[PDB]
Design a protein around this nucleic acid. Structure first.
Ligand code: MG
Ligand code: MG
Ligand code: MG
Ligand code: MG
Ligand code: MG
Ligand code: MG
Ligand code: MG
Ligand code: MG
Ligand code: MG
Ligand code: MG
Ligand code: MG
Ligand code: MG
Ligand code: MG
Ligand code: MG
Ligand code: MG
Ligand code: MG
Ligand code: MG
Ligand code: MG
Ligand code: MG
Ligand code: MG
Ligand code: MG
Ligand code: MG
Ligand code: MG
Ligand code: MG
Ligand code: MG
Ligand code: MG
Ligand code: MG
Ligand code: MG
Ligand code: MG
Ligand code: MG
Ligand code: MG
Ligand code: MG
Ligand code: MG
Ligand code: MG
Ligand code: MG
Ligand code: MG
Ligand code: MG
Ligand code: MG
Ligand code: MG
Ligand code: MG
Ligand code: MG
Ligand code: MG
Ligand code: MG
Ligand code: MG
Ligand code: MG
Ligand code: MG
Ligand code: MG
Ligand code: MG
Ligand code: MG
Ligand code: MG
Ligand code: MG
Ligand code: MG
Ligand code: MG
Ligand code: MG
Ligand code: MG
Ligand code: MG
Ligand code: MG
Ligand code: MG
Ligand code: MG
Ligand code: MG
Ligand code: MG
Ligand code: MG
Ligand code: MG
Ligand code: MG
Ligand code: MG
Ligand code: MG
Ligand code: MG
Ligand code: MG
Ligand code: MG
Ligand code: MG
Ligand code: MG
Ligand code: MG
Ligand code: MG
Ligand code: MG
Ligand code: MG
Ligand code: MG
Ligand code: MG
Ligand code: MG
Ligand code: MG
Ligand code: MG
Ligand code: MG
Ligand code: MG
Ligand code: MG
Ligand code: MG
Ligand code: MG
Ligand code: MG
Ligand code: MG
Ligand code: MG
Ligand code: MG
Ligand code: MG
Ligand code: MG
Ligand code: MG
Ligand code: MG
Ligand code: MG
Ligand code: MG
Ligand code: MG
Ligand code: MG
Ligand code: MG
Ligand code: MG
Ligand code: MG
Ligand code: MG
Ligand code: MG
Ligand code: MG
Ligand code: MG
Ligand code: MG
Ligand code: MG
Ligand code: MG
Ligand code: MG
Ligand code: MG
Ligand code: MG
Ligand code: MG
Ligand code: MG
Ligand code: MG
Ligand code: MG
Ligand code: MG
Ligand code: MG
Ligand code: MG
Ligand code: MG
Ligand code: MG
Ligand code: MG
Ligand code: MG
Ligand code: MG
Ligand code: MG
Ligand code: MG
Ligand code: MG
Ligand code: MG
Ligand code: MG
Ligand code: MG
Ligand code: MG
Ligand code: MG
Ligand code: MG
Ligand code: MG
Ligand code: MG
Ligand code: MG
Ligand code: MG
Ligand code: MG
Ligand code: MG
Ligand code: MG
Ligand code: MG
Ligand code: MG
Ligand code: MG
Ligand code: MG
Ligand code: MG
Ligand code: MG
Ligand code: MG
Ligand code: MG
Ligand code: MG
Ligand code: MG
Ligand code: MG
Ligand code: MG
Ligand code: MG
Ligand code: MG
Ligand code: MG
Ligand code: MG
Ligand code: MG
Ligand code: MG
Ligand code: MG
Ligand code: MG
Ligand code: MG
Ligand code: MG
Ligand code: MG
Ligand code: MG
Ligand code: MG
Length: 247
RNA sequence: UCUUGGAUUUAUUGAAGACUAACUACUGCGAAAGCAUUUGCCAAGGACGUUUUCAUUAAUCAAGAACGAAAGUUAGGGGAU
RNA sequence: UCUUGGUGGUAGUAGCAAAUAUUCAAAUGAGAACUUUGAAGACUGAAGUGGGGAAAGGUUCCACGUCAACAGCAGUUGGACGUGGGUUAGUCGAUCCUAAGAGAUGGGGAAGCUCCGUUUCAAAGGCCUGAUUUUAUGCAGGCCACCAUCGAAAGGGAAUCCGGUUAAGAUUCCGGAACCUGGAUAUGGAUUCUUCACGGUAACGUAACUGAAUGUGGAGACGUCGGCGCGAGCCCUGGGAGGAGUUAUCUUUUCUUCUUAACAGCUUAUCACCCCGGAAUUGGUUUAUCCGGAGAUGGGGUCUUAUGGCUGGAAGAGGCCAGCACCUUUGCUGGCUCCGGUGCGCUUGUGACGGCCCGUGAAAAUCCACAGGAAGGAAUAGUUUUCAUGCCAGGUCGUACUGAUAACCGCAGCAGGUCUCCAAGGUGAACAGCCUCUAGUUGAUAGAAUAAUGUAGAUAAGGGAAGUCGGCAAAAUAGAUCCGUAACUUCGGGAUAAGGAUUGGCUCUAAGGGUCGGGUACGAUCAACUUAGAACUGGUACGGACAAGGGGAAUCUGACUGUCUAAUUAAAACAUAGCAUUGCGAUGGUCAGAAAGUGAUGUUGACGCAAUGUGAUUUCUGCCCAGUGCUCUGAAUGUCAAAGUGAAGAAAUUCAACCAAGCGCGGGUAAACGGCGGGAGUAACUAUGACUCUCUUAAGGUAGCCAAAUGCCUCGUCAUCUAAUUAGUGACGCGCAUGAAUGGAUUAACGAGAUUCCCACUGUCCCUAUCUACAUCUAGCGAAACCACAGCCAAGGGAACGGGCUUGGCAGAAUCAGCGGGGAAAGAAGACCCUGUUGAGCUUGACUCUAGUUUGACAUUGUGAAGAGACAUAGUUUCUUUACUUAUUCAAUGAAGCGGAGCUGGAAUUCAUUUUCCACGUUCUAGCAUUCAAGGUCCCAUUCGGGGCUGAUCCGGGUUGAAGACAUUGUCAGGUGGGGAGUUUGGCUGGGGCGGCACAUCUGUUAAACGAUAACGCAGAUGUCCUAAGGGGGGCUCAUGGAGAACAGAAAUCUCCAGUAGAACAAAAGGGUAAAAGCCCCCUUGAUUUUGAUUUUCAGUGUGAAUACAAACCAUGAAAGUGUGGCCUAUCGAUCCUUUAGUCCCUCGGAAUUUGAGGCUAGAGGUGCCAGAAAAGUUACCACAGGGAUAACUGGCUUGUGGCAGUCAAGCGUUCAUAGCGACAUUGCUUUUUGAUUCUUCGAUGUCGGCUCUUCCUAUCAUACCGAAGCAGAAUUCGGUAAGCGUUGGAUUGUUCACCCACUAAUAGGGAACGUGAGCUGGGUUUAGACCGUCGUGAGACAGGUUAGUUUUACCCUACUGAUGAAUGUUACCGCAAUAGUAAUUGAACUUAGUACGAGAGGAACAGUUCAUUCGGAUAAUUGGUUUUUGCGGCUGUCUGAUCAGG
């Protein structure tokens, strides 16, 4: 009869993300006239490390088109992007790794990253390290582009949505064992409080639906309805199937 | 098993992965395992030709090594048949 | 267990015993263990008992006075009491900045208190003018797109040091010497006739050397570890100049002073850079291996100033001395304060590097620089107050003291707790331990004595775990050097494996450095601690104190490191990496919030977030989709609500069709929950069963593993381990009840985990003893628990265990030290068990709901179409989709470039027309891009400048995109919803639970001849059945037997005789019944209506059932009569509500009519727990009220059962009942078995076993004396008197019990609250933690297995053991002995004697002597043990200068 650990996560007190050492939000440049009609040249100044993020972050300086000053945009660095490299962003930009282009102005089978779902949301898709979006189709009439997502999902998005050529740098990061609890400790120390995880079968019945009993066991099906309520969704929620991928 | 929620079949436009038919032979190349679409680059090789050059530098080889179909193993990718 | 207050006994008692320790004198004082001073002795031993601070405290600081209380003794003293005094800042902090975060406003939400939100969807804003007289400077232009505020006395940050000074303040006061900020402001220098400096190739330099808007950059501003290098301070050390110590002796000796701050000038560096140069024969180079044609080495330079040097500060200060003054005011005068060295030293700062990360290790205020070029200034002068000097100011608050064995929190002056800085010498690896210096303390109630029992520390012959649940506790080992080092292994380890040597002192030796250099065959000099070797030496000692691993062989278990139940469980539990599954592509997943223009993940995006399971590596993860869950564009006339539609109705309304999701149907899914069988026949063995068959399955337990922490039986069987093993290990496996990510098997390493064995080692034990330090007595001080009254027993009875009562024993003041038998001692209204119509935690398919979610409808909600959209010259909305935007919604931005038209070029082949299109100034490069923009063109009224226009196309003022009448939101409707809420979870009962129903009933009996009568008494029965099995009438007689008839018999039909019921009557059993109540036939509905009376249950209520009538109407028979269900005794049901029948009756209250409703009378629908709630579990996490009305353990009664006896004598005993036995029977005893009971205790009598220790019984095992024998001897067997005296050591098990190895004279049985826990122990059981197996959906259960789990108090009374003692004239000595206690026990050998006896085989006893066992009482000559004799000697470290002598 006690509020369980996943229900306490939404109150956001000790389960907030640890955001002191992060460099800022990584976004694309704002979709302005220069990117909508031509291109703009920025410069990679630093490739830095973002805390909690597996991917390195490029700091790219553009000239402000309407005032005399410099705008520093924070990009997710694509693999091969180097300091001092010019980055071109706009409809008329070229097919180079690091360049920011609308997806309608881009051929088929092109690998892109930091892809807007809607034109002007400044980067939504394929942002984690090593991830990319394949362009798998164009529907020029009532402009739409079919893309393939890193989960394998096909998705039709707008041709005016912008992506960045290349894959996200930092790939292969989950290819290393952590080997030890301290490396997971320092990994999650700058993400958020979600580790270590006590199992619900190891708790009392007051703490979890899986809690209690004279042996640690579940006792009802771990598969939970989508139409179940908070406190009940502790297991394999709305599972179409279970078990190993074996035919 | 699929099928009036139109299967199978027909047309058009795609995507993906493998494979490289027919030509293909008592034909070729490679130390062998092997190697068959095109083009480019890169290093190599046999045979022939030579009134070039060096002049026994060679033959086979315990130990030692490189390569070694398929299946299989480990970890990613890919996953059409 | 009343409330408040007061007071006792206990009681002058328990105690005032941790932190090594005090002592002598004098002074003061009434009074000194405790105050002060001297002296001595000690300690903290620089991670301090020292010197300061942070929090907290708040005057405790300091002085004077003073002791009533407080300082658990004292007090003259005090952190006490009384009275005062004391905290000084431009520089130290706060103040300021931001951090995680807090929070106004605008705005939205909320009935509201208030919530959200923090730049959001706001008309959110104040700053310089280039420097002056129409200016309190503004009524001039011009710029900034930022957005409250709070938030750190440890982060960031402007600037102060030294010396002196108080009773108490100081980086704050004084003296000297600085520095910073803000302001004003001149002078000197610099700069200008080339207006805004000059030099250097350059890196860069300098005393300056204009510089607005705007932009850019830097600093602020950053992890951790390692070695290296440098600096500071400390340490060590040499010379010299002073002072003190020692000086029988030695010691150019031992100690001590010898200092230089902030700030300032000049210099000084790793790194970095620049110039020249052009490198392979590759060079330079770090402890660490990096660097060089992207220019090395080398040769010149430049720079930062960490840091150091010199100087100023500044010797005048500070220190050490000397001499003279010696109530001198109070000093005066003089001297010296100097020169080195050393280093893996210690601490700290710092540099350049290296390593680590799926971790890459704050922000802001603030300050500076650069870019730019607005603007302004060159001749008796302007600019810079970034050069120097000069002038003024710097507020407010804090500031004392402690920072703890006495200033803080813990009830207190409490052995607890509470953050940090500094940091001497030696030993030594060391910030260990030990000793010492500076500094600090010597505080803690004392004195005397040295009993028991303690606590703390020890030692121990011989044995060496025999102790115990268990090696618990202790001992053993230990540093370093050298040697040696197994299995196994994840190849990293294991590992200090195991084991073995050496070690002191002294005197030497050999190695290992730094400075030192060359001709256009050569060594002075300086310093250090490491290693190796050798001789000599000694009571063979030597890591000499201190400090300091026990090891090995295995098993179970969890990989490891880690975390955890604060205050009983540190684990095998949790976590972990690894593995796997699930959801989710954002108008989304998961989760918040009452709502919201609201949130967490999210400064996020599938290599991610979220939910789970399993738990490293290795190896594997089998089969099952029936169940349940989950899921699926899955089937769309199965079910279906609200709205809506249709019919009928006067209408309310009723009926009908349609009817979304969900459920139903079908599919998928087990690393979802889970589950994974029996029997028979079979091989040329007997069982065994590759195979086969049906029985049900969804599949039938696979690979593996196993009496496992999982196996009941079970201590399973075999082997091994031992003398002996319920232990361990290895096997075996029809496995109560093993098994595969509810993970199976393995596994190196690891473990304060559990277990077995072995070596070492030991007081664990045999078997105890001794020693040291800290109860007793005293002076002082002085509680508490508890207490009906009290305190000697035995027996009886008694609420079945008395201190009191009864009958006996008896019994003499006052006591002290012990002690644990009793006070069913104390501590707590029993946590176990039960009850209560008392709860709570938790679960679920309980009952009833509910947040949320999902689906529909209506509203928001407008504008068009197509319209297989309505009902056959016929319709804007109607069972399908897409068009519009302006509502709504989402999103972004400094609301910047949207939409539509506008020059050319052409692969439009200008078809004389943009039916018609595309391109809108930027892609080698880490530069730069700003001043309403230069240009061009026009006007000013011209003023050294200004204004237009174009450059830069017009027009629409839709910021831009998405989405769209769908989302959203509101209301209602259906579904889902242990997420959450509330509640329930009957009773009786030889305790409760399970079972049963003895809960409403009927027959017989129990039941004791009226009636009534109990038990979970006995044997049974009821919840029905019947249109006849009811009613009436009539005829007949049944069961059974005998005697006869073709098939035909024991049984088929027919005939006769007998037949009192032996048959039948629906169903139990009892009663009843013969021209019937049975059987068969005929006619029927009296099984009807009305409403009373009565009987039985009983209260003389109800209900059920029955009796007899009365009023009718009927049936039947000729009739009398009978019939108001069943031949009689059982066969059943309130109120409320619904429904039907009856009158056509009452009411709808302003009057009606008609529907509808309500009513009156009679039934039905149902309460079986049957006088009638609507109802699942669990609790070992538990709670409360109680209960001895009631279980678990003692006692009591009983004695089936257990144990022990007797009588009788069939029969056994070669013949022979009774030597010894003894069947079939039968009579007893006991209370050490287990039942039976529930009398005592539930405001608690401590629950198993062992250890220890005493006594008692006798039903006698041994020993003594005897009787009997199928007693020749020997050895046995039976029995008597007898409890005097003994009755053991071990292996396994927690055990009791058992079983085995031994030894013995024998290893008898019992009791004493199943003797004995304020005697212990805690292995077991029986709290809370954890694992397994089975069970359960689950929470959870299991007299199943396993592991871990706080054992309190005596000082009171008695009892006991010891010890005093008043009174008897006093005192003293010597005695007596009533009474009480009593103590010795058992064996062997020799001789008897190889004798008696015996055919032999074998083989005694008494007497005698010698010893021994167990017990007891002493004792210490000897032997051993003990050592504070601190007696003598030795040894380590340190200290007293050495020695001697010591601490
Ligand atoms: Mg809670
Ligand atoms: Mg809670
Ligand atoms: Mg969770
Ligand atoms: Mg956050
Ligand atoms: Mg986590
Ligand atoms: Mg995990
Ligand atoms: Mg987990
Ligand atoms: Mg638990
Ligand atoms: Mg739950
Ligand atoms: Mg559970
Ligand atoms: Mg588990
Ligand atoms: Mg579910
Ligand atoms: Mg071909
Ligand atoms: Mg793939
Ligand atoms: Mg009171
Ligand atoms: Mg009193
Ligand atoms: Mg007294
Ligand atoms: Mg004491
Ligand atoms: Mg004294
Ligand atoms: Mg003395
Ligand atoms: Mg000492
Ligand atoms: Mg006084
Ligand atoms: Mg006192
Ligand atoms: Mg005193
Ligand atoms: Mg005082
Ligand atoms: Mg300050
Ligand atoms: Mg602030
Ligand atoms: Mg509002
Ligand atoms: Mg405040
Ligand atoms: Mg501060
Ligand atoms: Mg900081
Ligand atoms: Mg600070
Ligand atoms: Mg500041
Ligand atoms: Mg001065
Ligand atoms: Mg100059
Ligand atoms: Mg700077
Ligand atoms: Mg580190
Ligand atoms: Mg390290
Ligand atoms: Mg200064
Ligand atoms: Mg200073
Ligand atoms: Mg500049
Ligand atoms: Mg002031
Ligand atoms: Mg003040
Ligand atoms: Mg002060
Ligand atoms: Mg205080
Ligand atoms: Mg206390
Ligand atoms: Mg204390
Ligand atoms: Mg205190
Ligand atoms: Mg000292
Ligand atoms: Mg004391
Ligand atoms: Mg001994
Ligand atoms: Mg031994
Ligand atoms: Mg043992
Ligand atoms: Mg123990
Ligand atoms: Mg060694
Ligand atoms: Mg060793
Ligand atoms: Mg070992
Ligand atoms: Mg040796
Ligand atoms: Mg020596
Ligand atoms: Mg185990
Ligand atoms: Mg562990
Ligand atoms: Mg606790
Ligand atoms: Mg533990
Ligand atoms: Mg657990
Ligand atoms: Mg957030
Ligand atoms: Mg299934
Ligand atoms: Mg299925
Ligand atoms: Mg799983
Ligand atoms: Mg199973
Ligand atoms: Mg087994
Ligand atoms: Mg066993
Ligand atoms: Mg076992
Ligand atoms: Mg065997
Ligand atoms: Mg086995
Ligand atoms: Mg499985
Ligand atoms: Mg393994
Ligand atoms: Mg452990
Ligand atoms: Mg020994
Ligand atoms: Mg002993
Ligand atoms: Mg003794
Ligand atoms: Mg005493
Ligand atoms: Mg006394
Ligand atoms: Mg008193
Ligand atoms: Mg006291
Ligand atoms: Mg008391
Ligand atoms: Mg009395
Ligand atoms: Mg009695
Ligand atoms: Mg008595
Ligand atoms: Mg009494
Ligand atoms: Mg009496
Ligand atoms: Mg009497
Ligand atoms: Mg009497
Ligand atoms: Mg008598
Ligand atoms: Mg007596
Ligand atoms: Mg006395
Ligand atoms: Mg006494
Ligand atoms: Mg005692
Ligand atoms: Mg007692
Ligand atoms: Mg009570
Ligand atoms: Mg009670
Ligand atoms: Mg009840
Ligand atoms: Mg009751
Ligand atoms: Mg509770
Ligand atoms: Mg509407
Ligand atoms: Mg509108
Ligand atoms: Mg816009
Ligand atoms: Mg709508
Ligand atoms: Mg609503
Ligand atoms: Mg629920
Ligand atoms: Mg509930
Ligand atoms: Mg019972
Ligand atoms: Mg009864
Ligand atoms: Mg009678
Ligand atoms: Mg009876
Ligand atoms: Mg009865
Ligand atoms: Mg009945
Ligand atoms: Mg019947
Ligand atoms: Mg009645
Ligand atoms: Mg009555
Ligand atoms: Mg009845
Ligand atoms: Mg009847
Ligand atoms: Mg009748
Ligand atoms: Mg009848
Ligand atoms: Mg009622
Ligand atoms: Mg009326
Ligand atoms: Mg009327
Ligand atoms: Mg009516
Ligand atoms: Mg009605
Ligand atoms: Mg009636
Ligand atoms: Mg009824
Ligand atoms: Mg009743
Ligand atoms: Mg209670
Ligand atoms: Mg009773
Ligand atoms: Mg009995
Ligand atoms: Mg008995
Ligand atoms: Mg008996
Ligand atoms: Mg007898
Ligand atoms: Mg005879
Ligand atoms: Mg009581
Ligand atoms: Mg007692
Ligand atoms: Mg006898
Ligand atoms: Mg004898
Ligand atoms: Mg005896
Ligand atoms: Mg034993
Ligand atoms: Mg027993
Ligand atoms: Mg014997
Ligand atoms: Mg007895
Ligand atoms: Mg007894
Ligand atoms: Mg007992
Ligand atoms: Mg006892
Ligand atoms: Mg007792
Ligand atoms: Mg005890
Ligand atoms: Mg006991
Ligand atoms: Mg125990
Ligand atoms: Mg617990
Ligand atoms: Mg299980
Ligand atoms: Mg245990
Ligand atoms: Mg424990
Ligand atoms: Mg006890
Ligand atoms: Mg006593
Ligand atoms: Mg004895
Ligand atoms: Mg004697
Ligand atoms: Mg001794």
């Amino acid at each position: 009869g006690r509020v369980i650990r996943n229900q306490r996560k939404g109150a956001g007190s000790i389960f907030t993300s640890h955001t002191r050492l992060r460099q800022g939000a990584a976004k694309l440049r704002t979709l302005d006239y220069a990117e909508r009609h031509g291109y703009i040249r920025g410069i990679v100044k630093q490739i830095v490390h973002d805390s909690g993020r597996g991917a390195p972050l490029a700091k790219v300086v553009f000239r402000d088109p309407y005032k005399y000053r410099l705008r520093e945009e924070i990009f997710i660095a694509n693999e091969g992007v180097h300091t001092g490299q010019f980055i071109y962003a706009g409809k008329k930009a070229s097919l180079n790794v690091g360049n920011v282009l609308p997806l309608g102005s881009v051929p088929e089978g092109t690998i892109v990253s930091n892809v807007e779902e809607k034109p002007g949301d400044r980067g939504a898709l394929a942002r984690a390290s090593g991830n990319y979006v394949i362009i798998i189709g164009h529907n020029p009439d009532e402009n739409k582009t079919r893309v393939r997502l890193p989960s394998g999902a096909k998705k039709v998005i707008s041709s005016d949505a912008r992506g960045v050529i290349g894959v996200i740098a930092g790939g292969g990061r989950v290819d290393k064992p952590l080997l030890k609890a301290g490396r997971a400790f320092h990994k999650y120390r700058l993400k958020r409080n979600s580790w270590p995880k006590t199992r619900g079968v190891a708790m009392n019945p007051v703490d979890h639906p899986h809690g209690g009993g004279n042996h640690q066991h579940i006792g009802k099906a771990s598969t939970i309805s989508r139409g179940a309520v908070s406190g009940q969704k502790a297991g394999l929620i709305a599972a179409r199937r279970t078990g190993l991928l074996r035919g």
